[PDB]
Amino acid sequence: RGSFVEMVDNLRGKSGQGYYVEMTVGSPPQTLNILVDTGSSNFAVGAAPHPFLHRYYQRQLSSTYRDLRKGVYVPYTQGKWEGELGTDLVSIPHGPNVTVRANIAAITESDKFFINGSNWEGILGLAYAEIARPDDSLEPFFDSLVKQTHVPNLFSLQLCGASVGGSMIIGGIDHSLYTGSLWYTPIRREWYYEVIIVRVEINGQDLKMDCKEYNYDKSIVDSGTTNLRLPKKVFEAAVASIKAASSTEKFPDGFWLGEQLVCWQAGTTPWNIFPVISLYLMGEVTNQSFRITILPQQYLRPVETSQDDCYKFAISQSSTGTVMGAVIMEGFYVVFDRARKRIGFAVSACHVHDEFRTAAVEGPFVTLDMEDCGYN
Pick from Na ion, ligand 1HL, none: which does 224 bind, CB < 5 to 8 A by kind?
ligand 1HL
The closest of 363, 353, 346 to 156, measured between CA atoms, is: 346
In the list Na ion, ligand 1HL, none, the entry touching 113 (Cβ below 5 to 8 angstroms by class) is ligand 1HL
Q: Identify which of 74, 72, 80, 96 has the alpha carbon closest to the alpha carbon of residue 23.
A: 96
**CB burial string 128-167: b at 16+ within 10 A, e below:** beebbbeeeebbbbbbbbbeeeebeebbbbbbbbeebbbb
Does 308 participate in catalysis according to the annotation?
no
Contact assessment for residue 320 and residue 232, using Cβ atoms and an 8 Å cutoff: no
How many Cβ atoms are within 10 Å of 82's Cβ, its own excluded?
A: 15
Of the pair 158, 185, the CB lying nearest Na ion is at 158
Q: For residues 221 and 361, which CB has a smaller minimum distance to ligand 1HL in the complex?
A: 221
φ, ψ of residue 98 in degrees (nearest 5): -150, 160
Whichever of 156 and 318 has its CB closer to Na ion, that residue is 156
Select which of 37, 88, 174, 337 is catalytic: 37
DSSP 296-308: HHHHEEEE---SS
CB neighbours of residue 182 within 10 Å: 21
Beta partners for 194?
A: 220
Answer whether 165's CB lies under 8 Å from 9's CB: yes
Whole-angstrom Cα distance, residue 4 to residue 12?
17
Measured from the CB atom, the residue of 140 and 224 that comes closer to ligand 1HL is 224
Question: Nearest CA to 122 among 139, 110, 136?
Answer: 110
Q: Which amino acid is at 161?
A: G
Nearer to ligand 1HL, 24 or 226 (CB): 226
Span from 12-20, 167-175, 254-262, 268-276 in contact with ligand 1HL (CB under 6 A): 12-20
Residues lying near Na ion in the complex (CB under 5 A) are found at 146, 175
Q: How far is the CB of 347 from Na ion (least distance, A)?
A: 10
For 121, the 3-state DSSP assignment is: coil
Side-by-side strand order, sheet with 197-202: 205-206, 197-202, 277-282, 288-294, 360-366
The interface partner of residue 175, options being ligand 1HL, Na ion, none and the CB cut-off 5 to 8 Å by kind, is Na ion
- Sole window of 176-184, 223-231, 243-251, 290-298 interacting with ligand 1HL (rule: CB under 6 A): 223-231
Under the binding rule (CB under 6 A), the answer on residue 137 touching ligand 1HL is no
Q: Which does 321 bind (CB under 5 to 8 A by kind): Na ion, ligand 1HL, none?
A: none
Are 200 and 215 within 8 A, CB to CB? Answer: no
Catalytic residue chosen out of the listed positions 67, 222, 253, 308: 222
In terms of CB distance, is 50 or 175 closer to ligand 1HL?
50
- Told to judge if 37 belongs to the known catalytic residues of this protein, a careful annotator would answer yes
Q: Which stretch binds ligand 1HL (CB under 6 A): 23-31, 222-230, 263-271, 278-286?
A: 222-230
Judged by beta carbon distances under 5 to 8 A according to partner kind, the member of ligand 1HL, Na ion, none in contact with residue 17 is ligand 1HL
Determine the interface stretch with ligand 1HL among 70-78, 145-153, 273-281, 304-312 (rule: CB under 6 A).
70-78
What mask, x for binding ligand 1HL by CB under 6 A, covers residues 74 to 113? --xxx----------------------------------x
Show which residues are catalytic.
37, 222
Q: Which residues bind ligand 1HL (CB under 6 A)?
A: 16-18, 35, 37, 39-40, 76-78, 113, 123, 222, 224-226, 326
